[PDB]
Design a protein around this ligand. Sequence first.
Ligand SMILES: *[C@@H]1O[C@H](CO)[C@@H](O[C@@H]2O[C@H](CO)[C@@H](O)[C@H](O)[C@H]2NC(C)=O)[C@H](O)[C@H]1NC(C)=O
Length: 317
Amino acid sequence: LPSGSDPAFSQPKSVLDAGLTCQGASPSSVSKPILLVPGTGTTGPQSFDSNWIPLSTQLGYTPCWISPPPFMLNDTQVNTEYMVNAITALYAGSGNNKLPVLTWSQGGLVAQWGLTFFPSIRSKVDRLMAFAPDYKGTVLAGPLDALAVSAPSVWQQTTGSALTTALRNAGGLTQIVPTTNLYSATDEIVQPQVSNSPLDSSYLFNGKNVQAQAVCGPLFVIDHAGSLTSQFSYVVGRSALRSTTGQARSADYGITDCNPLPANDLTPEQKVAAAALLAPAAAAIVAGPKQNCEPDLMPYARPFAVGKRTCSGIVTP
Ligand SMILES: *[C@@H]1O[C@H](CO)[C@@H](O[C@@H]2O[C@H](CO)[C@@H](O)[C@H](O)[C@H]2NC(C)=O)[C@H](O)[C@H]1NC(C)=O
């Protein structure tokens, strides 16, 4: 892992702070915060209003989130600036207490990029609860890239990308704080996820890696959104948030929690919104920025992806 100083942010802290909020509180004075990091094509409320905002509130936290603009489609490295700044602010605002981070899709890649390249935060994050995290990117983005219709972060979330290379070469595929990864083989957005093994995009070494089919059997189906929103996902998430080890515990869930429907506690309307979650995010993707090349790596990450190709050409030391 990188050690040393946090890199400077490319955005002003005023801009970063404007991307962060807490439900019914300022980040500078907040009790039991949990930072939520949203998925590609969404803001915090869009990823989470149907699920972990009311679920995490009902578990006794104050939900905070970031909404890097536009809709998590811009440079993943910039999205991570929002996250790192948030952890610094919320640690201070909760009395210098460590806080959990809970994520969906890109949000987990963001958290892990943060922990990897901004060391100051490793001591401020309690645990990471990642749903369908794409630490290795996804193979599904490749063809879009080839047509130059991919957003900046979609390029970066491509299997083989300069960004995913850099993460793994800096040690980022090993958990850095106690981490639980809940994911599914039957994910239509993030693949590969089928091995129940280190090959899977959601796997971190020494993490609590929970492929839902490994617990629920090979005919259990939750998709990319259901990975976040299901009753089985809630049980695992709850376990991870409550656990004195910082990871979910096999003792806390079993066969009888293998309900693929949205989390029981959610309102009828939240359940309808949860089941429809992928539709607005795909629409935001389609409407957002698009380019013909992967955004450059920021100087701090270039030594870790020598030889990959970005907008300015081939990455050098
Ligand atoms: C998405 O990212 C692009 C590229 O970084 C941003 O476009 C730049 O924005 C800065 C700061 O506002 C401008 O000074 C540059 O001239 C822009 N460069 C471009 C278009 O190549 C864009 O602002 C970002 N989008 C959002 C919504 O924040």
